[PDB]
């Protein structure tokens, strides 16, 4: 698999699977700043899966590493905002992070292998 462009559709498919996960519910759209009035005191850079999908479709990611950084920001924001590790939304974030990491590893490996083959 030395296709330099294959990661994009692989990331679209993975986002589709994350949207089917019930555990993505709290992360499908920008955080509700009315409900969580302190949110932007705690979180410098909001991120959500709809923003990640729109950035991908706009052609504004150059690599799957950049997409992976934004998805990891969704999860670090949830860990920063949680009042406890025994919270529903943080708990959903941890299962969804495990699912994401399990699926993104081959996407990153294949991309990096394709770049190395291009420069051979």
**Quick check: helix, strand or coil at residue 48?**
coil
Q: What's the token pair of residue 22?
A: 């019930």
21 lines the binding site for ligand ZKU (CB under 6 A)? no
Residue 18 CA to chain centroid, in angstroms?
Answer: 9
CB 64 within 8 A of CB 108: yes
CB 71 within 8 A of CB 52: yes
The size of the chain, in residues, is 120
Nearer Cβ to ligand ZKU (10/93):
93
43 lines the binding site for ligand ZKU (CB under 6 A)? no
29 lines the binding site for ligand ZKU (CB under 6 A)? yes
Judged by CB under 6 A, the number of residues near ligand ZKU is: 12
Each residue 78-107 as x (binds ligand ZKU by CB under 6 A) or -, in order, gives x--xx----x-xx-----------------
* The Cα angle at residue 42 between residues 40 and 44, in degrees rounded to 5: 60
The upper half-sphere exposure of residue 9, i.e. CA atoms within 13 Å in the direction of its Cβ, equals 4
19 lines the binding site for ligand ZKU (CB under 6 A)? no
Nearer Cβ to ligand ZKU (8/70):
70
113 lines the binding site for ligand ZKU (CB under 6 A)? no
Q: Which residues bind ligand ZKU (CB under 6 A)?
A: 26, 29, 31-32, 35-36, 78, 81-82, 87, 89-90
């Amino acid at each position: 698999s030395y296709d330099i462009q294959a990661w994009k559709k692989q990331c679209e498919e993975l986002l589709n699977l994350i949207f089917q996960c019930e555990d993505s519910e709290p992360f499908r759209q920008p955080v509700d700043l009315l409900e969580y009035p302190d949110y932007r005191d705690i979180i410098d850079t909001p991120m959500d899966f709809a923003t990640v999908r729109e950035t991908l479709e706009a052609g504004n990611y150059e690599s799957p590493m950049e997409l992976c950084k934004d998805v990891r920001l969704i999860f670090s924001n949830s860990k920063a905002y949680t009042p406890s590790k025994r919270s529903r939304i943080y708990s959903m974030s941890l299962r969804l992070s495990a699912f994401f990491e399990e699926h993104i590893s081959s996407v990153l490996s294949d991309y990096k292998s394709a770049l190395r083959f291009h420069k051979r």
